[PDB]
Design a protein around this ligand. Structure first.
Ligand SMILES: Cc1noc(C)c1-c1ccc2c(c1)[C@](O)(c1ccccc1)CC2
Ligand code: NA
Length: 127
């Protein structure tokens, strides 16, 4: 069995910026989720080999994780906040698609998602 390459975190020709919203996504949103007791499964790509989940990347065709998001934010990879928000939502939705309601991993994603939603509610106006 084999893992796919991780999502892209570097691409010189891609348009990218720093915005105050993107700075908030790193300093508030990512920092908050990353320190959470339930962050650990989401801090790097799902290792389908190590976890013995050979169907994972047959089912999940747009993988995403906070390690990837962290690198994208640190590398100023994004053009806007929406792109980054989409990555978090992809991460959570993948977990719900693959797993079943009430699984520990799903409970963990729910806790992180609740906090995500509370933080992005206070996303600053772009300035
Ligand atoms: C994120 C994620 N999304 O689907 C799976 C499976 C995972 C995943 C990623 C990493 C790990 C586990 C599950 C793991 O099987 C697990 C199981 C129950 C609770 C926490 C982590 C061990 C490490
Ligand atoms: Na994923």
């Amino acid at each position: 069995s084999m893992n796919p390459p991780p999502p892209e975190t570097s691409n010189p020709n891609k348009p990218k910026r720093q915005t105050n919203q993107l700075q908030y996504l790193l300093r508030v949103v990512l920092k908050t989720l990353w320190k959470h007791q339930f962050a650990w499964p989401f801090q790097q790509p799902v290792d389908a080999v190590k976890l013995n989940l050979p169907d994972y990347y047959k089912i999940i065709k747009t993988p995403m994780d906070m390690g990837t998001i962290k690198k994208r934010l640190e590398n100023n990879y994004y053009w806007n906040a929406q792109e980054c928000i989409q990555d978090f939502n992809t991460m959570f939705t993948n977990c719900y698609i693959y797993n079943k309601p009430g699984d520990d991993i799903v409970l963990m994603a729910e806790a992180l998602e609740k906090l995500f939603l509370q933080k992005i509610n206070e996303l600053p106006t772009e300035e």
